[PDB]
A paper describes a structure:
KIF1A, a key member of the kinesin-3 family, is recognized for its high processivity and fast MT plus-end-directed motility. These attributes are crucial for the long-distance transport of cargoes in neurons. Mutations in the microtubule-associated motor protein KIF1A lead to severe neurological conditions known as KIF1A-associated neurological disorders (KAND). Here, we present 2.7-3.5 Å resolution structures of dimeric microtubule-bound KIF1A, including the pathogenic P305L mutant, across various nucleotide states.
Numbering used by the authors:
A (entry chain K): 4 to 389
B (entry chain A): 1 to 440
C (entry chain B): 1 to 432
D (entry chain E): 1 to 451
């Protein structure tokens, strides 16, 4: 399965209105076209994705993309895959002012909610409706931020100490002491969310009134327990849902950064450049052997140059079904930066997922052998040979 | 008056400035301490020429210059050397480390906190002027300071002053020899500065001057001192029309008018003909025809480019010495008779000439021989694109793998800022390959 | 001003330090009592890099001495230069690490690290504009590895902008002095690969081979090895202290040498070495310096550069010489040996020239190479590590001090990742 | 600064202590009465080394030692001998009968009423020390006191102190010759406390030292004094790194870290290479390579066991005198090429090196030649198990018929605290067999698959 890719355009901001600008991006169906303000009517480019989203014009319903539309398009399928048993992940991307946060968080106070609370709503409704005497669910949450190559917990109370990152030899990288908390209702997780979003570190720039200074990841552990005490086993399925709100690419001459802000921007840019290299290299690695010869050339991908890539190594490649949501600025001023985002979005589409559903090996083998033996015994008994 | 302000940035600029100011002081009769005994022995004249020296009440002559660098180890040699009493004490070191061959450090993080002092000193220097004509900026590509800080300074100068001419004397990277691994990034990132804010950029190459020293001057093991002396001679030959009398004088605006057909092609080459040792100064007439033919030799160019592969768009010749216009008009004809030198179709004239009476001086301990006729040529041609193209290839080989990029990103620069610059450079190349296409 | 703080840890680092301050004192001109009795005027111009001033015109070295055994402190004090260092900087304890990495890193060093950091803060606060740190230690022991990596982590946490260097004496292939070298080496490299900007790989076997085959000594001792290491140490930093034609701060070397963050392991070299009796036959000039400098038997890391590819190399010359000759020689050594240089870096030699040579020499040169062959060394340790971790050979000494097997496993995994990273560029082809 | 208490129990321990303290006094220039005129002649120095001696106001030095026994006959020789004024009067003798080659009497019928006083004196000695390294217990298997009282004392010390190191130097029964009939019972009953509580135990044999004295020093009729002198030289070479300056120093804990792989196999053998008479001290170079080679010769071992029948798990070399690390590296390299010496595959390095500058001293009236270089080697190997097996056979031949058992049970011992010890010993004999086996071929199943 390929890494799914969604693209969305936001409307103009006051910064793009005080300094006059024009709309450069168009789209039809799943295809998006980029025009060149600097050399117009020379080489308009086009790129094909899984989803394109025109949220420029709210008053008109002509191919308008609401939050519920994007959610029903990708988050519903991700939650369905999670209910099947997969571990799933959809992470944002874009430049400072692309609306990556407006897409993954949205505004709780309005009906235009992001793709994090609507999943939570759908998950809680599904488990509440599907709960029975022989069906139960256990849901736990965690939320961590990466400020400058240090992991901080938002759910925990004030704990100044930074958290250490370890590598379980079988399970891969993880964080130690990440405050994982169980939830039983919508209101509980919502209060946890309010605390987490309030704890996140933000700062004001010339490009955005309230910008983010840290990457942020929301992890939900979902446990399906089928309780037929006579026949079945409990804790049947375990799944991981993770949504990522990356920090925006900083430009310096067009943000006004200075002092501490400049250092934060430099760290953010280093992390994003490492992520981009990982994306391109991974896409090359999965594209080549699949069609070249199948030789499995041992060019290995390197996630150790940043804690972001290290933590998200499973989601980038391996046992996870993953998708991207690139936010774009329509103004001509950002034409270069926007174009880069589009290119990276294209590099995300070629990446392949290697995801499986697995359980305890003894249970799986015993059940399969029992099914095979039952079929063979039924065939033998039906013919009088047993 | 006719006055210029010199700005030297980085180690290369500072050392070239040392050589240049040694030459000017020897030319005008100013002692290293600033006093001029010629005034008290003569009692007249204008040997305190205002083009480079400002006179105080006591009789001292302070030069119009601003030295800049981001480390103390180079400029301190000036502060404790032979010329310590000539310059003003304000020499504008940053009391920190250097840019470490990094454009981002020299343009965004460390390049600031000294730009304001430099601008204040330049403003003070220009306030004393009464007819300032232009600026002379000396720097070197491939260095963090000479690229980044020069870019910042050029932006600020263009904003502040605007109309004054801004010439450039720069050291382009060589095709083969090099002294840093990340030269192409620093050289490509500064195309915007030399292309947008500069008015006429002259370039030289270390390999070409090494070959000239090896062949013409018979120096087997040259060092940077000889290179600096040669560049100083060329700058003096350019500027001499402002200071001394002559039969035909050429101002800086005339150079810009005749060497720059369109705004974006202000990248001429420079050559200096009678480079010859004292032993070989005999056995040769060194007449006008010999020296003016020497300029067109491919082997005597100061950048490793072959003029035969392109077309000559403009040419400016500056003679210093016992030259009479008759001999000049006759050579311009012979070189127009020769077929190996190609001129574009839309420039039927081609040549500008200027003559000055003051012959070149000799630096004690130098390697050039005393001579009575010299000529400096500045030629706008299409061959320079060759020297660009090679560099672009090198850039690609390092940018495909994002080598040495995290150093630049960690200091405040964005990744896309690389690629954008490259496109600009390509566009520049494209325009020097469509001003020659014969007209139809 | 560009001021360096020096730290020494363990017996090996302490003794190497001693001989470094006997090579940096003579070059500037400092008496053992701390007074100045030099001749040239350029010796005091940049003395503040490595020396603080004291009221009687005296100069104290800006250093810090660390151990967990008083014996090495007593040996240094009872010596020719024991009285030059500040008494308050002699930080030490008792009941040393016992060749155990856990004791140095977790149990014993965790008490002394606070005092050492207090001294470091006091020393760094007095500086005008701090350049970076440098630390000398051996990876085969307990005190060195443990407290060195702990101090590196703490200092990098507190001073993130500054450049950090290390000079590591690392386990030899055949020569062995202790039995639990692989565990300590692996656990120390796991931290070194993360919390440093440059690392220089020293190996005892290479130094012994140089002393035998090049210097023709009959009975080498540790003093000669310290002599060579000190010469390289001074040559690396010569450009901060004396003027020249081309200059190279430590940061410039770091920028030009490190293409990607996890590749900062270097092979050092020095020239000329002549053996005290063959100098009358050997001429001295730039080509012969380059010839000895690029030779495989000169390198101090016991790794053959011909088994891989030079990522990037750097040469710092000291003396009065022409630039054309230097550039021509570097171009020639590039072109003749093009098989051993990576193809996607068009020019991978950094050059620097300083005017003042050492006292008794007319010319000298130092070499910092970065090549893939270093991976070989790590493989050796890795193999040995497996041979003792498959059966828990000496594990209970470590786990008894508050450690677990997961740390060993992830430490091995990180080194294997580093080896795979270095290998990726080693093989030919690759190209565009 | 780095103190070590020495505890001597039994006749063998007391006599080895006499030899050891004679050597130490000769080494540090302390007269038998405790005074040190060399310091007065020098005018000041650190010769009053705190590793073994404690200084008082008047300049007298008292050793850090604790002698214990139940027979007054042995301690009374010291109390009226040459060193009567050196030791503190507290010599801790039990003015009663002796254990009489009976483990039970030494342990918990006569070992009581004297253990408390011994522990009090050891507490005072340890309180005087400003930083301890460990203990050095000298005893002998076979004897009643040296088994039972040693077991009780180690039990109490392990309870009280716990973390501090505890070393042994013990006389194991010889394969053929013996001076008692009920030795195997005592040795087997001692092995449990030797195993659980001690941290590193060295063993020596009288027969091997007799053979060494005969072949090397050309003494046809040796006595216990020569053997005690050799053991004293071994212990001095062990502890030399704490006292004198050296290029590479090895602390007592470094031995444990580098020499014992697992907690239950801490039974190494010891050897001393340049044992040679004064007459034969000439005609020979005695270089570093020669002594290093001699350390591995099976004939020079101090326990009657062949290293060729097992495998070397680890080794530790301590050099003393004019040695330069280069020759040591060359010696180790040539040893690593021989095929007779075998090393377990899971210890590729298998060597520890330590160099000290002080050369060994010569005791007046001794039989060892004055030399300029010496080496002491400690090898942790699997051959030693063979020796144990021999002794084990003897035990069975006496326990089938319950011979000499009523003496043991008559002093408050259950019959089944015998067989129990045997089983423990058997378990130990299993482990030394298990560790020495090479790793099974491709221990992690089989490899080789897609990449
Ligand atoms: C007659 C003559 O030419 O004397 C030379 C000499 O013969 C040679 C052999 C010297 C000599 O070096 C050695 O023999 C040596 C032995 C072991 C380890 C290192 C060196 C010399 O000792 C070393 C000494 O070096 C210096 O004087 C430098 O200043 C040197 N100084 C020290 O290292 C030093 C050591 C202790 C106390 C004070 C200073 C230095 C080198 C690099 C950076 C800083 C300082 C020199 C030129 C020589 C002798 C005296 C024979 C050489 O040493 C170096 C590294 O320069 C060996 O390689 C050079 C080549 C020289 O020709
Ligand atoms: N012609 C000539 N070129 C020089 C001279 N000195 C340095 N260069 C050139 O300068 C380049 C190196 O960059 P530099 O200008 O020295 O760097 P910088 O100005 O000191 O700035 P930093 O790197 O931050 O120190 C080399 O490629 C040299 O060719 C000189 O004296 N004469
Ligand atoms: N090497 C050596 N061994 C000795 C020496 N003295 C006694 N032994 C050994 O010790 C054994 C006897 O045990 P001891 O501990 O001396 O007996 P004890 O100390 O008198 O205690 P009891 O058994 O109660 O009498 C003998 O078999 C000897 O082999 C000695 O001086 N040197
Ligand atoms: N499509 C949209 N519709 C309505 N409001 C939007 C939209 N996009 C952005 N905004 C508002 O404008 C601001 C910019 O969006 P935001 O999501 O903060 O950018 P970002 O991609 O997160 N980059 P950063 O500011 O660095 O976090 C937000 O505060 C939103 O409230
Ligand atoms: N070059 C050099 N190496 C040494 C010296 N002394 C010891 N070593 C090396 O250091 C290693 C032992 O490390 P050690 O000093 O005990 O580390 P520590 O115990 O933590 O202080 C051995 O492998 C030796 O090769 C010396 O004087 N010079
Ligand atoms: Mg955001
Ligand atoms: Mg510089
Ligand atoms: Mg007795």
């Amino acid at each position: 399965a390929s890494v799914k890719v969604a693209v969305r355009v936001r409307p103009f901001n006051s910064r793009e209105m005080s300094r006059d600008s024009k709309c450069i991006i168009q789209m039809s169906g799943s295809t998006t076209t980029i025009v060149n303000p600097k050399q117009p009517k020379e080489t308009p480019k086009s790129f094909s994705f899984d989803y394109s989203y025109w949220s420029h014009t709210s008053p008109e319903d002509i191919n308008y993309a609401s939050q519920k539309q994007v959610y029903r398009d990708i988050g519903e399928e991700m939650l369905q895959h999670a209910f099947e048993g997969y571990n799933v992940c959809i992470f944002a991307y874009g430049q400072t002012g692309a609306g990556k946060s407006y897409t993954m968080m949205g505004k709780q106070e309005k009906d235009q909610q992001g793709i994090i609370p609507q999943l939570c709503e759908d998950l809680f409704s599904r488990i509440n409706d599907t709960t029975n005497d022989n069906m139960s669910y256990s849901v736990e949450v965690s939320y961590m931020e990466i400020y400058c190559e240090r992991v901080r917990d938002l759910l925990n109370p004030k704990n100044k100490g930074n958290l250490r990152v370890r590598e379980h030899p079988l399970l891969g990288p993880y964080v130690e002491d990440l405050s994982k908390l169980a939830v039983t209702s919508y209101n509980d997780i919502q209060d946890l969310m309010d605390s987490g979003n309030k704890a996140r570190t933000v700062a004001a720039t010339n490009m955005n009134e309230t910008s983010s200074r840290s990457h942020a990841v929301f992890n939900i552990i979902f446990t399906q327990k089928r309780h037929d005490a006579e026949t079945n086993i409990t804790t049947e399925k375990v799944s991981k849902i993770s949504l990522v709100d990356l920090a925006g690419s900083e430009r310096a001459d067009s943000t006004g950064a200075k002092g501490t802000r400049l250092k934060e921007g430099a760290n953010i840019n280093k992390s994003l450049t490492t992520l981009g290299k990982v994306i391109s290299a991974l896409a090359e690695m999965d594209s080549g052997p699949n069609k070249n010869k199948k030789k499995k050339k041992t060019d290995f991908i390197l996630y150790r140059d940043s804690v972001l890539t290290w933590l998200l190594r499973e989601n980038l490649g391996g046992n996870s079904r993953t998708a991207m949501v690139a936010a774009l600025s329509p103004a001509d001023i950002n034409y270069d930066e926007t174009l880069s985002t589009l290119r990276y979005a294209d590099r995300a589409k070629q990446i392949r997922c290697n995801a499986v559903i697995n359980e305890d090996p003894n249970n799986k083998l015993i059940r399969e052998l029992k099914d095979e033996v039952t079929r063979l015994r039924d065939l033998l008994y039906a013919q009088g040979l047993g | 008056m006719r006055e210029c302000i010199s700005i030297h940035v980085g180690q290369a600029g500072v050392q070239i400035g040392n050589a240049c100011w040694e030459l000017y002081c020897l030319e005008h009769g100013i002692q290293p301490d600033g006093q001029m005994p010629s005034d008290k022995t003569i009692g007249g004249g204008d040997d305190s020429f205002n083009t480079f020296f400002s006179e105080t009440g006591a009789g001292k002559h302070v030069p119009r210059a601003v030295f800049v660098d981001l480390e103390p180890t180079v400029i301190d040699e000036v502060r404790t050397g032979t010329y310590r009493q000539l310059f003003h004490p304000e020499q504008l070191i940053t009391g920190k480390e250097d840019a470490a061959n990094n454009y981002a450090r020299g343009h965004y993080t460390i390049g600031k906190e000294i730009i304001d002092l430099v601008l204040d000193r330049i403003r003070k220097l220009a306030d004393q002027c009464t007819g300032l004509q232009g600026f002379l900026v000396f720097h070197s590509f491939g260095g963090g300071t000479g690229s980044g800080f020069t870019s910042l300074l050029m932006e600020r100068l263009s904003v502040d002053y605007g109309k004054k001419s801004k010439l450039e004397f720069s050291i382009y990277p060589a095709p083969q020899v090099s002294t840093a691994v990340v030269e192409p990034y620093n050289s490509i990132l500064t195309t915007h500065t030399t292309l947008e804010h500069s008015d006429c950029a002259f370039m030289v190459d270390n390999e070409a001057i090494y070959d000239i020293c090896r062949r013409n001057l018979d120096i087997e093991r040259p060092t940077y001192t000889n290179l600096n002396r040669l560049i100083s001679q060329i700058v003096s030959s350019i500027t001499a029309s402002l200071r001394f009398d002559g039969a035909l004088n050429v101002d800086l605006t005339e150079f810009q008018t005749n060497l720059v057909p369109y705004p974006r092609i202000h990248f001429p080459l420079a050559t200096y003909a009678p480079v010859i040792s004292a032993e070989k100064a005999y056995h040769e007439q060194l007449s006008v025809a010999e020296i003016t033919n020497a300029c067109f030799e491919p082997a005597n160019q100061m950048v490793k480019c072959d003029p035969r592969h392109g077309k000559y768009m403009a040419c400016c010749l500056l003679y210093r010495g016992d030259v009479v216009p008759k001999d000049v008009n006759a050579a311009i004809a012979t070189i127009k008779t020769k077929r190996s030198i190609q001129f574009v179709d839309w420039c039927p004239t081609g040549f500008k000439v200027g003559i000055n009476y003051q012959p070149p001086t000799v630096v004690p301990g130098g390697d050039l021989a005393k001579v009575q006729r010299a000529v400096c040529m500045l030629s706008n041609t299409t061959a320079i694109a060759e020297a660009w193209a090679r560099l672009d290839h090198k850039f690609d080989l390092m940018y495909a793998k994002r080598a040495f990029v995290h150093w630049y990103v960690g200091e405040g620069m964005e990744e896309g800022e690389f690629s954008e610059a490259r496109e600009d450079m390509a566009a520049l190349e494209k325009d020097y390959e469509e001003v020659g296409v014969d007209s139809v | 001003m560009r001021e360096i703080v020096h730290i020494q840890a363990g017996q090996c680092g302490n003794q190497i330090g001693a001989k470094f301050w006997e090579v940096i004192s003579d070059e500037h001109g400092i008496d053992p009592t701390g007074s100045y009795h030099g001749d040239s005027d350029l010796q005091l111009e940049r003395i503040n890099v490595y020396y603080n001033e004291a009221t009687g015109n005296k100069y104290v070295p800006r250093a810090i001495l660390v151990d967990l055994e008083p014996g090495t402190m007593d040996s240094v004090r009872s010596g020719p230069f024991g009285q030059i260092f500040r008494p308050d900087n002699f930080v030490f304890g008792q009941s040393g690490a016992g060749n155990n990495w856990a004791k140095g890193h977790y149990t014993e060093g965790a008490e002394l690290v606070d005092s050492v950091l207090d001294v470091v803060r006091k020393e760094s606060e007095s500086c005008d504009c701090l350049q970076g740190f440098q630390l000398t230690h051996s990876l085969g022991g307990g005190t060195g590895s443990g407290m060195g990596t702990l101090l590196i982590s703490k200092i990098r946490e507190e001073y993130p902008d500054r450049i950090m260097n290390t000079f590591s004496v690392m386990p030899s292939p055949k020569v062995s002095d202790t039995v639990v070298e692989p565990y300590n080496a692996t656990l120390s490299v796991h931290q070194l690969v993360e919390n440093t900007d440059e690392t220089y790989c020293i190996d005892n076997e290479a130094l012994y081979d140089i002393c035998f085959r090049t210097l023709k000594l009959t009975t080498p001792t540790y003093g000669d090895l310290n002599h060579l290491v000190s010469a390289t140490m001074s040559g690396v930093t010569t450009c901060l202290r004396f003027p020249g034609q081309l200059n190279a701060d430590l940061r410039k070397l770091a920028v030009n040498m490190v293409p990607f963050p996890r590749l900062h392991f270097f092979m050092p070299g020095f020239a000329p070495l002549t053996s005290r009796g063959s100098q009358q036959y050997r001429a001295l000039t730039v080509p012969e310096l380059t010839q000895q400098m690029f030779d495989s038997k000169n390198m101090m890391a016991a790794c053959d550069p011909r088994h891989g590819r030079y990522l990037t190399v750097a040469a710092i010359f000291r003396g009065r010489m022409s630039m054309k000759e230097v550039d021509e020689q570097m171009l020639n050594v590039q072109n003749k040996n093009s098989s051993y240089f990576v193809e996607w870096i068009p020019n991978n030699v950094k050059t620097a020239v300083c005017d003042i040579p050492p006292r008794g020499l007319k010319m000298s040169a130092t070499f910092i190479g970065n090549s893939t062959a270093i991976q070989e060394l790590f493989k050796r340790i890795s193999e040995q590590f497996t041979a003792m971790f498959r059966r828990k050979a000496f594990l209970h000494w470590y786990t008894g001090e508050g450690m677990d097997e997961m740390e060993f496993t992830e430490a091995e995994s990180n080194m294997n990742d580093l080896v795979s990273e270095y290998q990726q560029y080693q093989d030919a082809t690759a190209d565009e």
